[PDB]
Every structure is written in C-alpha cells, then in structure tokens.
Paper text:
TrefLec was searched for original domain combinations, which led to single out SaroL-1 in the choanoflagellate Salpingoeca rosetta, that contains both β-trefoil and aerolysin-like pore-forming domains. Recombinant SaroL-1 is shown to bind galactose and derivatives, with a stronger affinity for cancer-related α-galactosylated epitopes such as the glycosphingolipid Gb3, when embedded in giant unilamellar vesicles or cell membranes. SaroL-1 is composed of two domains, a β-trefoil domain at the N-terminal region shown in blue and an elongated domain (green) consisting of seven β-strands forming a twisted β-sheet. The lectin-binding step is necessary for the pore-formation since the pre-incubation with a high affinity galactose derivative diminishes or abolishes hemolysis, GUVs penetration, and cytotoxicity.
Residue numbers in the entry: 4 to 327
C-alpha cells in the first residue's frame, strides 16, 4: 500500500503535477482559484480538487533560463517570494517574471519525506502559523527549518509515454539455471524400429516473470498498460507489457513472447524392444539490472526515471531421447 511517509516521489522537471500538503490533504492553489492569477497572488492550501482543474497544475523548471524554479501551469507565472527575496515569513506568490537564484524553489528529500525548499538556503515552505492541519486559504510562506508536518506530495497531473528502458549493462547481474523435465516412458515392444510421437506439457515449470521496482514509487502516470523491449538474457530483447499506477513501488510485467516450448511433440525412432523418454533441458536467466526509463510528455518533452528491472526468462531449450 502507498504511504507518503516513505514513498512520496521527487518530481521530474517539465511534467505537470498537483502539489498536496500530506498531513492536511489540501492542495496548493493560487488564492481565489483563478487559471490566470494576478501578480503577487499568494499560494494557499485548499481542499478543492478536480483532475480537470488546470489552475491546480504546477511544473518544476530547471534550465539555463529558469534554474530550480516552479511555474503555475495555466498562467506560466513563476513562484516568487513576495518582494523578490526569500526570508522569514515571505509569502509564496505567483509573478510573471523569471526566477532568479534568490527565488529558487525545488522539492527535496530530507530524512525520508519530500519538502519544498529554497535552493542554497535552510528556508522551506510552511503554512503561515505552522499548523500541521491548516484550514483552507492558509497562505504558504518561507521559514527556516523543516519538520514532518510540512511535507508535500507531487501527484502526477498528466499521462506520459514510455519510449524505452535502457539497462545499465555494467551493473546487470545474471544467474543461470537449468530446469530439467522428463516425458512419460515409451516402449517399442516390436522387433522393428518404430517412428513414435512423444509429447510433454511444461507451462507450470517454465513460467517467465518481470517487474520494474522503485526506491520511493514510480511517481508518473503512463496509463493502464505499456509495452517495451527488455534484455532478459544478455542483450536479447523480449517484449514485456507492464500495468501499474504512479503510486506503486513494484510494477508487474507480463513477458509477451517465449524462445522456448511449453508443449513439446518429438518424433522419436525407438529401437526394437527398447524403452525411451525425452529429456527437456530449459535454461532460465534470473536478472537484476538498474535501468533508466525514457518517457515523453504529449508536448514532446523527454524525461527520465531510474528503475530496477528484475526478471526470470526461459531462453534456450534442448530435447534429448534417453534410455529408461
Ligand atoms: O513579489 C514578487 C516579485 O518581487 C519583485 O517585483 C517587485 C515587487 O516586489 C512586486 O510587488 C511588484 O508586483 C507588481 C507587478 O509587477 C505588476 O504587474 C502589478 O501587477 O502590480 C504588482 C504590484 O502588486 O513588481 C515589482 C517589480 O515590478 C521582483 O522583481 C519580481 O521578480 C518578483 O520576485
Ligand atoms: O508561519 C510559519 C511558522 O509558524 C510558527 O511560528 C509562529 C508564527 O506563525 C510565526 O509567524 C512567528 O514568526 C515570528 C518569528 O519567530 C520572529 O523572529 C519574528 O519575525 O516575528 C514573527 C511573527 O511575525 O513565529 C511563531 C513561533 O514563534 C511555527 O512555530 C514555525 O515553525 C513556522 O512553521
């Protein structure tokens, strides 16, 4: 189950988020709720939420023009300290002016929780008055220091595409095993060699699996199913379809193809008066690999998320006729 106390993800720049004060469950709004808030309009906490409400969307910006800043999505205004310098009890406001070093703001992780902090300072974002459960329209201010009641959750507010997942080949660990299976015995009780068909079913013992796992939670919305190629054995690509939620720290995959058979039917020449069986050796690669996810916004912005790919894949298989 999802717990923000351990699982709140760090937001990726360029992506739309809602911002929620964890302990009150309130969202960060421009005071008054406008899609076009006025310059020096205060950021406040308010219970009000609808997924369709663009006035509640925020985007972290980190580039040459705006290094460590925070943008109101619907207006394009930046989050500034009222008056233009961070200090004690400076109200967070929107303003249609570029960010500066003295306005920098980002989400940070401190002791296992996520906070808003003015970069290169000990000033963090507090509800004015410092209530752990502030009421609607409580303004957000900079103030020195943090504590758990101040934590925020950046909830993803748009749906991204998964373009590819590239494993870090130097950190990939592979453990190989052989799964060995035997058919029913077949006897040729005649005095002449005989063509016979020996069949065996192995669905249960050759089951493939795969998953992505995350330190906090995945933290991004990509829809109910996505498919990518992953190197489940050496560099060999196998398509895996994943179904999960932004809140999951483990996203289960379904391995979509197999290089091996789970129903075997072998044409055997059985010598006179001999008994034989088929032996099936199937190789299994259990793999763990740190990887980088390559994602993309509808607007064409390319973002990255680190993960770990864990998998079990049956990849080569051999069939031998053996005496009983
Ligand atoms: O407050 C954040 C803002 O501080 C500095 O801007 C100056 C004032 O502090 C700010 O109050 C003032 O706001 C103007 C806005 O420019 C006008 O369109 C109009 O909407 O009235 C308000 C007054 O409420 O603007 C001045 C500078 O023009 C920083 O320069 C700015 O970047 C932010 O950090
Ligand atoms: O507002 C965030 C702040 O709330 C609590 O602090 C109290 C007041 O809310 C805060 O305004 C007040 O600030 C003092 C400041 O300590 C003094 O140095 C001087 O500037 O006066 C202001 C009042 O304008 O401080 C009190 C607590 O003394 C929380 O305790 C604090 O941690 C923040 O979350």
């Amino acid at each position: 189950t999802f717990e923000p106390a351990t699982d709140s993800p760090l937001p990726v720049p360029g992506v739309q988020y809602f911002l929620q004060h964890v302990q009150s469950g309130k969202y960060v709004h421009p005071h008054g709720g406008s899609d076009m808030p006025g310059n020096d309009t205060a950021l406040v906490l308010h219970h009000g939420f609808d997924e369709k409400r663009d006035a509640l969307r925020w985007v972290f910006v980190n580039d040459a023009e705006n290094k460590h800043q925070l943008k109101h999505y619907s207006s394009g205004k930046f989050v500034h300290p009222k008056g233009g310098k961070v200090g004690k009890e400076a109200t967070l406001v929107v303003h249609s002016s570029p960010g500066r070093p003295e306005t920098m703001i980002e989400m940070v992780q401190e002791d296992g929780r996520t906070y808003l902090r003015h970069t290169d300072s000990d000033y963090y974002v507090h509800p004015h008055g410092g209530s752990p459960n502030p009421g609607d329209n409580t303004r957000l201010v900079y103030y020195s220091g943090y504590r758990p009641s101040l934590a925020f959750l950046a909830i993803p507010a748009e749906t991204l595409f998964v373009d590819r997942i590239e494993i870090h080949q130097a950190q990939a660990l592979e453990s190989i095993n052989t799964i060995t299976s035997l058919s029913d015995e077949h006897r040729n009780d005649t005095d002449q060699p005989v063509q016979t068909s020996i069949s065996v079913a192995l669905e249960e013992s050759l089951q493939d699996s795969a998953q992505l796992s995350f330190e906090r939670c995945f933290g991004l919305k990509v829809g109910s199913e996505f498919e990518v190629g992953l190197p489940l054995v050496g560099k060999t690509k196998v398509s895996v379809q994943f179904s999960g939620s932004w809140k999951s720290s483990t996203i289960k995959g379904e391995v979509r193809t197999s290089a091996v058979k789970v129903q075997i039917n072998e044409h055997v020449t059985i010598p006179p008066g001999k008994c034989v069986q088929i032996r099936i050796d199937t190789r299994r690669c259990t793999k763990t690999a740190p990887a980088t996810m390559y994602l993309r916004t509808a607007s064409g912005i390319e973002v990255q998320r680190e993960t770990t790919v864990t998998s079990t894949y049956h990849y080569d298989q051999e069939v031998h006729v053996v005496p009983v």
